[PDB]
Amino acid sequence: EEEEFNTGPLSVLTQSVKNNTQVLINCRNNKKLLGRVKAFDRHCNMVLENVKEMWTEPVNKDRYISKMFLRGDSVIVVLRNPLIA
Amino acid sequence: SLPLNPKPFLNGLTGKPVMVKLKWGMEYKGYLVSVDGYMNMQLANTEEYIDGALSGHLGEVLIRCNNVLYIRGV
Amino acid sequence: MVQPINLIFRYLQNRSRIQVWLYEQVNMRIEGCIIGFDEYMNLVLDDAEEIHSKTKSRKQLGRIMLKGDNITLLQSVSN
Amino acid sequence: HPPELKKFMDKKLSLKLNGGRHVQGILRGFDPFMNLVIDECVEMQNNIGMVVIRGNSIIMLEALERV
Amino acid sequence: VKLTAELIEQAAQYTNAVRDRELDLRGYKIPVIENLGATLDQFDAIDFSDNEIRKLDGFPLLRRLKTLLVNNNRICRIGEGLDQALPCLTELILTNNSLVELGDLDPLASLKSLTYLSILRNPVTNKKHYRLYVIYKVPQVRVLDFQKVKLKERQEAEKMFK
Amino acid sequence: GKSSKMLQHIDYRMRCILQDGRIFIGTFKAFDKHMNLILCDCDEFRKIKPKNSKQAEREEKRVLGLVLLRGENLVSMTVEGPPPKD
Amino acid sequence: IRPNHTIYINNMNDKIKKEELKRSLYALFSQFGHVVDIVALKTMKMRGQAFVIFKELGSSTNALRQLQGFPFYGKPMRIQYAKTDSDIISKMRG
Amino acid sequence: GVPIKVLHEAEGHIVTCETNTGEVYRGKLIEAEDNMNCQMSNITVTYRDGRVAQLEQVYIRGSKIRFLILPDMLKNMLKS
Amino acid sequence: MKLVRFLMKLSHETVTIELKNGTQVHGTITGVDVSMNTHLKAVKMTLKNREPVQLETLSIRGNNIRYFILPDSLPLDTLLVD
RNA sequence: GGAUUUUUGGAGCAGGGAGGCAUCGACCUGGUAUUGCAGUACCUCCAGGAACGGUGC
């Protein structure tokens, strides 16, 4: 199982936790959560730090959330990048 | 071909340029790095095509399995 | 009695061109020749097409793996 | 478990599907997921022949015969 | 043989030939329509044929009742608050009863959804202008005595009685 | 640990919120793994949950009776009133 | 053609929609006994016709004699005993 | 599940069923499966527009049921 | 690993939860179970496009949760130990 | 001590916008055809009429 977290597509999350790097999460709510992965699981539940939530309403909006838990079903996409840099 | 199944097809397509359509109509073109048992998908040098038009160049990307409509080699 | 999975196995063997009804999307359906499939009804389609029932327009796809999540219905077409 | 559908085997049926979709045809078989084989199927009208309906997207069925 | 709660509870209940839920109250020699509360508003049709009812009255509020078959009874009068207890009454079959005066059919004007009406084999039928009278006083009827109410009859009934 | 969080509210009158946004108020008598619920003397509300709305408290109320609700379509529950003694 | 639970009607105005025809047929024929079911199609072959099935046989005979040539939607209906027994009757009998 | 046992208890009784799409089916419950698959007979159906229809025989998948109304004859499983 | 276990440790914390249907819930956790079914007390709940209502108790089916906003103070590194 | 009927999850996420356009279905008037033994997506046709109904944007 660890092997599948380590080398499979979830290695994106595994890599973000290890390097304390930022990732953008496109989300079902049409919102995007930008931050660092403290923890994750099979379902893509996550505990996130320094989250910048961004969305639109046209008007763009954002808000800072230091500490939060995301239920993984809401995940559409998870992006790793030269974002942290 | 003599029976070509989902799983091998996808495995043959690893290392290749793919495009994935999502149920929500977004499309993501990039090199398929890997897939897992639940058919979650990892792309590199991803690009986003929405309305079939280049929207955003995104880099390395995880797509949750439940979002996927279909995958195409391209 | 014919079991649904077997019908598919038949579609596969026949190389009949297949038209798929998708879930909660009526304006588009998918077409192709089933080359193989798995326990989740995920399908490998050849020379596949998006069919726009509204626009009468077809989008050419080639090698497709369609997740079974989307499958509402499976039919055969003469074309 | 199996769905209890042997009673409906080889009978003409009216099938309400999701998306407000409706078809009619003769039950030729089923599996534990309630996926169906329907013969002489008609989209409500145009004839589509023998088809597979995934049980997932089956809302309701109604017999057009007496069981 | 009073129409009672107990009577209604043992009465044949089924889906009729036109696909409606119908209660069978035929041949019980019922004299007065009463205690319908016990049906619990669960029927689309109620068959009261071959009984001895004198007046079409006594109904509770029944929102689902759309068809009333009242053949071979002794109906000589129609109650006045019928729409208040039967809002969607669409079909009323009164064949072979005792309605004698055109004015006795007046209470049917208040049944807003009434579309199928049959009053054959009632003395009232032979009264001069019976058909035109019904058409003008109960315009919501589309089929009267199994014949289509036509435009020409409506106009003709508009002259006479205008 | 305790499993009680549902068992506590059993026999009580409960306000249950559905996924379409309906309000089911009934006596909470049973549940299960899926949160399929058994609601005695159950009514449905649509427009409001009253907090003493001076105009009226009750519009589109329907008496249902004995209700089994599937857990798929349940969102949440709060205590509405104490158990009826009966 | 011996007395039958089912009567065959022909010479009916085929312009009436099928569901309306069946509902008026039911209404008209209820005066003689419980009508179990009505079979009427608008195919070329079957248009202008209907089979009316009664629980009681005496009801079918009474209906036949009393409504012979009754004006229905403009035309005089022609009634006759059906050639065969109705499927519903055969199932209800055995 | 406890509710499932109570459902099976309603077999042979008149019950009301609302689907996920809000069509309302009332009639006799013939068979109820463990997964909530429901066979019924002599139905009255009330659509979302308000119109009614009549059906002899129906079978509805458990997943696509929102809820069921059962008789009050059952209310009198008080152990749990 | 199983992050629901982490949430199960948050009894007596106050949190804000955003639901899938957009509703916002602020209250004190009395219990999270294995299905992420969450129970709270002293709850101020604001359905999207209403003014808040206060409930002494509220019980959420786990699947209907979008996300929890946790106390800034929360010592995550402690809670992530098993 | 997690492998199909219960307790170690197949569910999840997604709906407002505006104050005419597309599609289907009865439908209403005239006239016209069919006279046959049925278990029904619908049911003649020709001309006219829709300040009709549903759904989507």
- Tell me the count of D-H CB pairs closer than 8 A: 44
Minimal CA–CA distance to G87: which of G37, G17, G27, G15?
G37
The range of the structural domain enclosing residue H8 comes to 1-80
Residues G6-42 as b/e (b if ≥16 CB within 10 A, e otherwise) read bbbbeebeeebeeeebbbbbbbbbbbbbbbbbbbbee
Q: Which residues of E37-48 are buried (b: 16+ CB within 10 A; e: fewer)?
A: eebeeebbbbbb
Q: Give CA–CA dist B3/G90, Å, rounded.
A: 52
Both tokens assigned to B62? 């995880």
Show the domain range for G83. 1-94
CA max distance for chain G: 40
Per residue, the 3-state secondary structure of H42-62, as one string, reads EEEEECCCCCEEEEEEEEECH
Which nucleotide's C1' sits nearest to the alpha carbon of I49? J16
Q: Which of helix, strand or coil describes residue D57?
A: helix
Alpha helices in H1-80 (DSSP H): 2-9
Please name which of B25, F53, D61 lies closest in space to residue H25, comparing C-alpha atoms.
D61
CATH number of the domain bearing residue G52: 3.30.70.330
Q: Answer whether I34's CB lies under 8 Å from I69's CB.
A: no
- Using an 8 Å Cβ cutoff, are B63 and B41 in contact? yes
CA distance E53 to E51: 6
Å separating the CA of residue E130 from the C1' of nucleotide J51: 33
Residue I78 CA to residue A67 CA, distance in Å, equals 14
CATH number at residue I1: 2.30.30.100
Closest by CA to E118, choosing from I9, G31, I5, B45, is G31
Structure tokens belonging to residue E72: 């071979």
**Distances in Å between the alpha carbon of H74 and those of A4, A71, G64, H41, H62?**
51, 39, 49, 20, 21
User: For G40, phi and psi rounded to 5 degrees?
Assistant: -150, 130
Partners of B22 in beta bridges: B68
- C-alpha D20/C-alpha E2 separation (Å) is 48
What are chain C's partners, defined as 3 or more CB pairs within 8 angstroms?
B, D
Interface check A78 vs B, CB under 8 A: yes
C-alpha B20/C-alpha A9 separation (Å) is 15
Judge contact between I6 and I79, C-beta under 8 A.
yes
Total tally of structural domains belonging to chain H? 1
Which residues fall within 8 angstroms of residue C19, CB to CB, at 6 or more apart?
C29, C30, C31, C51, C74, C75, C76, C77
Residues listed for chain E: 162
Whole-angstrom Cα distance, residue B49 to residue C30?
19
Q: Which two tokens stand for residue E161?
A: 């009685």
Q: Which residues pair with residue E15 across a beta bridge?
A: E21
Strand pairing class (G35-39; G50-54): antiparallel
* Gap between the terminal Cα atoms of chain D: 22
Place of tokens 């279909």: B70
Query: HEC states along A22-57?
Result: EEEEEECCCCEEEEEEEEECCCCCEEEEEEEEEEEC
Please say whether the beta carbons of G10 and G83 come within 8 A. Answer: no
Per the DSSP assignment, residues forming a β-bridge with I67 are A70, I18
| Nucleic strand J contact set for I 40-59 (CB, < 7 Å) | none
CB proximity list for G44: less than 8 A, separation 6 or greater? none
Chain H, window 26-65: residues with a beta carbon less than 8 angstroms from a chain D beta carbon: 31, 33-35, 37, 39, 55-61, 64
The fold for domain B1-74 equals SH3 type barrels. (2.30.30)
Breaks in chain D after (C-N > 2.5 angstroms): 44
Residue H17 CB coordination number (10 Å) = 23
**Residue range(s) defining the domain that contains residue I55:** 1-82
Beta bridge partners of C25: C22
Report the relative pairing of strands E67-69 and E45-47 from DSSP bridges: parallel
| CA pair distance B3, B13, nearest whole angstrom | 16
Q: Is E79 left (phi over 0), alpha (psi -120 to 50) or beta?
A: beta
DSSP state of C38: -
Nearest CB partner across the interface for C35, out of B1, B68, B69:
B1
Domain ranges of chain B: 1-74
Cβ–Cβ < 8 Å for B70, C30? yes
Parent domain of F6: 1-86
Stated as kind and residue range, the H or E segment containing C72 is: strand C71-77
The Å distance, CA of E79 to C1' of J41, is 41
The token pair at H73 is 């004859």
CA atoms of H7 and H70, how far apart (whole Å) = 8
Structure tokens given for H51: 């119109």
Secondary structure, 3-state, chain F: CCCHHHHCCCCCEEEEEECCCCEEEEEEEECCCCCCEEEEEEEEECCCCCCCCCCCCCCCEEEEEEEEECHHHEEEEEEEECCCCC
Cα–Cα distance, E51 to E30 (Å, whole number): 5
Tokens of B35: 């897939």
Q: Are strands F37-45 and F23-30 parallel, antiparallel or unpaired?
A: antiparallel
Q: Which two tokens stand for residue G62?
A: 């009474």
As to burial, measured by CB atoms within 10 angstroms (0-12 exposed, 13-18 middle, 19+ buried), residue E156 is: middle
Task: Give the total number of structural domains in chain I.
Answer: 1
- B57 and B31 Cβ atoms separated by less than 8 Å: no
Name which of F18, F45, F76 to mutate to probe chain I: the one with the most chain I Cβ atoms within 10 A of its Cβ.
F76
Instruction: Tell me the C-alpha to C-alpha distance, in Å, between residue F57 and each of D7, F43, H68.
Output: 49, 14, 26
Q: What is the 3-state secondary structure (H, E, C) of chain E?
A: CCCCHHHHHCCCEEECCCCCEEEECCCCCCCCCCCHHHHCCCCCEEECCCCCCCEECCCCCCCCCCEEECCCCCCCEECCCHHHHCCCCCEEECCCCCCCCHHHHHHHHHCCCCCEEECCCCHHHHCCCHHHHHHHHCCCCCEECCEECCHHHHHHHHHCCC
Residue D66, classified by CB atoms within 10 Å of its CB into exposed (0-12), middle (13-18) or buried (19+), is exposed
Type of residue found at A6 = N
CB-based contacts of E114: which residues, under 8 Å, 6+ apart? Answer: E89, E90, E91, E92, E108, E138, E140, E141
| Residue D47 touches chain H, beta carbons under 8 Å | no
Of 3.40.250.10, 2.30.30.100, 1.10.600.10, 3.30.870.10, the CATH number of A1-85 is 2.30.30.100
What are the residue ranges spanned by the domains of chain E?
1-162
Cα torsion angle, F3, F5, F6, F9, sign = positive
Q: How far apart are CA C39 and CA D53, in angstroms?
A: 16
CATH 3.40.50.150 is the classification of domain E1-162: no
The domains of chain D are located at 1-67
What's the CATH code, domain D1-67?
2.30.30.100
Q: CA H72 → CA D41, D42, E87, H9, I71, distances in Å?
A: 41, 41, 28, 12, 47
Distance from the first to the final alpha carbon of chain E: 46
How was this structure obtained? Answer: cryo-EM
Which of H60, A67, C51, H40 is closest to D59 using CA atoms?
H60
Q: What are the CA-CA distances from residue E32 to residues B2, E87, E120, F60, I11 (Å)? A: 79, 21, 22, 36, 68
**Residues 6-35 of chain C sitting with CB below 7 angstroms of strand J:** 24
Q: Nearest chain G Cα to E120, which residue?
A: G28
Test G30 with E47 for CB contact under 8 angstroms: yes
The Cα–Cα gap between A38 and A20 comes to 8
